[PDB]
């Protein structure tokens, strides 16, 4: 409602770097807010795409940002009569970024890995890797839970059980308030998808450079399955955390699996031991239900609510015709131990091929009325197809079904404006939570500052 679309702030990265593909707010040890931006096609030392991360200090005028440097060199370790190899070419560093406390986690989901042993090998595959930084101290750590040292023959003999070779760890990421990093790995267990969790503190204290294959004992990975409903489900394409079991000592996981059960799609809520508490099934095959997930209490009852995006949902129209527009689903959490019912609200896009619901950002309480609000991105929506972000205000019954405000992309065609969103942080310290919108196709990020309400809705 009260985001200012007149005076924006623009940050920009190098051309072709996909700056803005992922972003997050970052607070330093003094509570000063900055913006961390992933640029997954930033050039590296060998003039080859490797990805990069930028840490943007808040400035009303925006501009260029300093790099957050990570080791971009391929590594080789000859140990235990084996050769361990990391491959960082086209790894997509910055394809996801997240901030927790004074730590930044930037992941390279397509970093490759191989183990050589005489004439045999593990196979050069995208296990993924995440890079951890404490910018103020310069500390660096890595986390790559799907690296193994098993040879190809063994996986074949065992019918590819517990095959983590194609995890793409860090595809999606989130950090619990207690500091547990939770990585989505949609390619884990031969494209079933897995989750990898470990405390940030333990990642740092157990990492040393050059080891390549080390133990993080407090880590916890999800489980394999023989059930074909999970095959090629990309469980972990998106991840989120929240409180859904009423016990405040446990943290619950929200996992998106947009191709679950032959592309029907699903979203699952789990406890920290990966036991399934709820499953929300998609409504329409290939709609990519679970592409994006969001957790926030929208109706002010203290209980977290779930939002699910299905950006390829095809809406039914006259004369038995379908129109791909995208859809968002709202599930209000019921009082006490009960199942999430049918959706409380359906939000459906209007622009053909707009992909409404590709990203969903909690905004906090934007208009300061007592109910939390959300922003939904249609990265190719709007009457011009340039991209659009729509704000929906919370209310006692859930959300308003019509948007209170629409942000039209200030960028040219193809910018994918909205593909990444983050809100609920006051970056200029004016008392209102603000919104950052990435447009990786234009290699830019737009900052929308919230201002006092003109008059309320």
């Amino acid at each position, epitope marked *: 409602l009260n985001l200012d679309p007149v005076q924006l702030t623009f940050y920009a990265g190098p051309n072709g770097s996909q700056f803005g593909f992922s972003l997050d707010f970052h607070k330093d040890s003094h509570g000063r807010v900055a913006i961390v931006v992933g640029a997954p096609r930033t050039l590296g030392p060998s003039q080859e795409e490797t990805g990069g991360v930028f840490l943007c200090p808040w400035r009303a005028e925006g501009g260029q940002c300093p790099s957050l440097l990570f080791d971009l060199r391929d590594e080789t370790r000859n140990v235990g009569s084996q050769t361990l190899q990391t491959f960082k070419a086209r790894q997509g560093l910055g394809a996801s970024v997240v901030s927790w406390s004074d730590v930044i986690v930037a992941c390279a989901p397509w970093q490759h890995w191989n183990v050589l042993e005489k004439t045999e090998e593990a196979e050069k595959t995208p296990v993924g890797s995440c890079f951890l930084a404490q910018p103020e101290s310069g500390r660096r750590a890595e986390y790559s839970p799907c690296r193994g040292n098993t040879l190809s023959r063994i996986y074949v003999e065992n019918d590819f059980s517990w095959d983590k070779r194609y995890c793409e760890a860090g595809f999606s990421s989130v950090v619990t308030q207690a500091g547990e990093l939770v990585l989505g790995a949609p390619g884990g267990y031969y494209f079933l998808g897995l989750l990898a969790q470990a405390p940030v503190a333990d990642i740092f204290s157990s990492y040393r450079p050059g080891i390549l294959l*080390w133990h993080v*004992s407090s880590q916890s990975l999800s489980f394999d399955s023989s059930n074909p409903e999970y095959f090629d489900g990309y469980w972990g394409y998106s991840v989120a955390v929240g409180e859904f079991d009423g016990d405040l000592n446990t943290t619950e996981y929200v996992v998106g699996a947009p191709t679950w059960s032959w592309t029907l799609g699903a979203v699952e809520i789990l406890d920290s031991y990966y036991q399934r508490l709820h499953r929300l099934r998609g409504e329409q095959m290939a709609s990519y239900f679970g592409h994006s997930v969001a957790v926030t209490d929208v109706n002010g009852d203290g209980r977290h609510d779930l939002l699910v995006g299905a950006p390829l949902y095809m809406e039914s129209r006259a004369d038995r015709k379908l129109a791909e527009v995208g859809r968002v689903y709202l599930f209000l959490q019921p009082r006490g131990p009960h199942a999430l019912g049918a959706p409380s609200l359906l939000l459906t896009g209007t622009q053909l091929y707009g992909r409404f619901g590709s990203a969903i950002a909690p905004l906090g309480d934007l208009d300061r009325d007592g109910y939390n609000d959300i922003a939904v991105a249609a990265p190719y929506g709007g009457p011009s197809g340039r991209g659009q972000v729509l704000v929906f205000l919370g209310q006692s019954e859930g959300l308003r079904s019509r948007p209170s405000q629409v942000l039209d992309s200030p960028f040219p065609t193809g910018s994918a404006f909205g593909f990444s969103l983050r809100g609920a942080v006051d970056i200029d310290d004016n008392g209102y939570p603000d919104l950052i919108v990435g447009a990786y196709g234009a290699n830019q990020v737009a900052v929308y500052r919230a201002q006092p309400v003109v008059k309320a809705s």
Partner: antibody
Amino acid sequence: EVQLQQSGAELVKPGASVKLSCTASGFNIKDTYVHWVKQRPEQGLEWIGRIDPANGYTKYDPKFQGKATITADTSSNTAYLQLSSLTSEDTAVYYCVRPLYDYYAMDYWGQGTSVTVSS
Amino acid sequence: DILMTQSPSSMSVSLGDTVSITCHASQGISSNIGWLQQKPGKSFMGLIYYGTNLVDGVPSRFSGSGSGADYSLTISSLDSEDFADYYCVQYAQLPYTFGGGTKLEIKR
């Protein structure tokens, strides 16, 4: 806290067999490689072999092929070292080892199990 | 098999001294070396892994160095407990192999 608790001292006769145990305390035996090392005063320290208790795959020094058989039971969180056709030169202290962080390192050691082979 | 020549077999030193134990391998092992301590009549304790990294809980007066085929364990300002046996172990190749050892003895 990681602790590797090994079985009590053994006193056996030549030609017989013995099975030493190494039970994990404060951690899951399935987490890391588990090695077995032999120590004698003159001959020093010799690496016998290792096992991955998660899957049972083993590796040995060819010197110990035939005499040493390393197994593991994740249910009881224990790793074993079976020695067969015992001789006087099998009289030694035997340690089970696991790494801290580096997959291939040798950092945590059990207290050792003394083996004495005599008629 | 990789031969580990550890030198010296023994040394008679005093409290507060800064001593160094070397280990020479028959071929390159690129820091894939560990250092071990065995106090008299007791079991082993890890000191160093991967050439330079202190095992959790080891005092910083211990430090490892070296590259290629030559490495060193250095104890700065010896303590009373530091008088014990020390061994190196390579894990660059299977089978793992150990050094002959080094016993730190009190000088008088």
